[PDB]
Write a protein that binds this ligand. Structure first.
Ligand SMILES: Cc1cc2nc3c(=O)[nH]c(=O)nc-3n(C[C@H](O)[C@H](O)[C@H](O)COP(=O)(O)O)c2cc1C
Ligand SMILES: Cc1cc2nc3c(=O)[nH]c(=O)nc-3n(C[C@H](O)[C@H](O)[C@H](O)COP(=O)(O)O)c2cc1C
Lengths: 210, 210
C-alpha cells in the first residue's frame, strides 16, 4: 500500500476532478482496488454491487453518452472510471451459490433450506423499491471504500451521479430490468488542486435521544 | 487515533454484534467520531445525513421499539447506537446558510442567487423518490466512514437496517415527512469473535466496457 495512513487517506480526501491524462492504471491493479473495496459490509452479505470499468478512449466515448457534460473533465482525464450499479436480483445470485453446494451433495437439503431461510423470504418478497433501496446502500458503502482505496494506492478520485439515469444501464450493456445506476468513481493521479469544501458543524446534525 | 493502520482498520473490519456492556463512550468522543465520519463526500456537498445518538438505557428501551428482535443483542450491549437518517429537505438547509451569508452582507444578492442556482433548482425539481435516493447515498457513505472511524478509535461496530421502517423516525422524535430511516450503527468494545464471512471473487461482479 502506497498510503496506509488512515487519517491522511480519509481526512484529506477531496473530490479530484482533473487527472493526469498520461497516467494509466493496469487492469490488475484496478481489479485489486475493487476487490479491496468489496471488503465492505452489505445487508445479509448479498454484496449487491456491480462494477463496470471504463478505461479506454473507446469506452469513455460510449460511456459519455449517458454522462452529463459538466462531468466530462473527470471522465476524459481519468485513468479509469469504475461505474457502480446495484444488482436488484443479488438475492438470487446468493441463492444460486448455495443451491449448487447442495446439488454437489456437500450440504443436505435441510441445511440449504436453513441457509435460504435467513435471507430469501425477506428479499424474495421485497418490493422493487426496497430492493432498489438496499442495493443503493451496498453500492454506496463500497463506493465510499473505493474512494479511500484509490488514495491508499497513491491515486485520487471523484464520485459522481450527474448522469442520465434512464440511459446509463443500457449504455453500459447491462440489463435495465435488473441493475440500478448509482454512481461513477473516476480514478487517477491528481493533476489539479481539488476545490476546497467545508462541512457543517456536526452538532447541528446530531441529536441525543436521551 | 488509536488505530491509524488503514489496511487493518478496513480489511479486518467485521460486524461485531456483542459488545462489552460495561464499556462506555463519552459524548465528546461520540460527537468527534461523527464529525470525522462526516468528512464523507455528498452530492452538491448537501451532507444530507442526520444522527440520533442512543447511549443511555432509557434511550435504548425507547429505540428498541422500532428495531427488529434479532438486532436486540447489538442494541442491548453496545456503548452507543448512532442512528443515521436522511434529510430530504437538506437543500433548504444549505440554502438557509447562504441566505445568512447575505443577511450578514458579505455577499451580494446576485452571488446568492448564483450560489443558489447551482443546486436549489435541481433539488426542488426532483421527485421525492430521488431526494430519498440521494439522501440514502449520503447516509450510506457517512455510515461506511463511521464504521471505519469507530475501529480507528479502538472500537468495533455493526451496521443494521433490520428495523421497523414505519416506527423508527417517529420513535426518534423526527418529522416523518422530512427524514427517512437508513441505518443504525451500534458501537462498542467487542465481547464476541464476529461471524466469519466470505466475499465473491470480485471478477464475477466486474465488467470491462471496452
Ligand atoms: C452521490 C454523490 C454524487 C456526486 N456527484 C458529483 C457530480 O455529479 N459531479 C461532481 O463534480 N461531483 C460529484 N460529487 C462530489 C461532491 O461534489 C463532493 O463530494 C462534495 O462537494 C464534497 O467535496 P469533497 O468530496 O471534495 O470533500 C458527488 C458526490 C456524491 C457522494
Ligand atoms: C445496510 C446494512 C444493513 C445491515 N443490517 C444488519 C442487520 O440488520 N443485522 C445484522 O446482524 N447485521 C446487519 N448488517 C451487517 C451484515 O450482515 C454484514 O456486513 C455482512 O454479513 C458482512 O459481514 P461483515 O460485516 O462482518 O463483513 C447490515 C449491513 C449493512 C451494510
Amino acid at each position: 500500500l502506497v498510503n496506509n495512513d488512515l487519517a491522511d487517506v480519509m481526512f484529506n480526501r477531496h473530490s479530484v476532478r482533473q487527472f493526469d491524462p498520461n497516467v494509466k492504471i493496469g487492469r490488475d491493479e484496478l481489479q485489486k482496488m475493487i476487490a479491496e473495496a468489496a471488503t465492505a459490509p452489505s445487508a445479509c452479505n448479498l454484496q449487491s454491487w456491480h462494477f463496470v470499468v471504463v478505461d479506454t478512449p473507446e469506452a469513455k466515448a460510449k460511456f459519455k453518452q449517458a454522462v452529463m457534460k459538466f462531468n466530462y473533465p473527470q471522465v476524459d482525464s481519468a485513468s479509469a472510471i469504475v461505474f457502480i450499479a446495484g444488482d436488484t436480483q443479488s438475492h438470487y445470485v446468493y441463492r444460486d451459490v448455495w443451491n449448487k453446494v447442495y446439488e454437489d451433495g456437500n450440504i443436505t437439503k435441510e441445511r440449504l433450506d436453513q441457509i435460504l431461510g435467513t435471507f430469501l423470504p425477506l428479499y424474495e418478497n421485497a418490493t422493487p423499491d426496497f430492493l432498489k433501496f438496499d442495493a443503493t446502500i451496498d453500492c454506496s458503502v463500497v463506493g465510499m471504500q473505493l474512494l479511500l482505496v484509490a488514495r491508499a494506492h497513491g491515486y485520487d478520485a471523484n464520485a459522481f451521479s450527474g448522469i442520465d439515469f434512464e440511459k446509463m444501464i443500457p449504455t453500459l450493456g447491462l440489463d435495465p430490468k435488473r441493475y440500478v445506476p448509482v454512481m461513477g468513481i473516476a480514478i487517477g493521479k491528481a493533476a489539479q488542486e481539488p476545490l476546497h469544501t467545508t462541512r457543517y458543524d456536526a452538532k447541528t446534525q446530531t441529536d441525543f435521544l436521551a
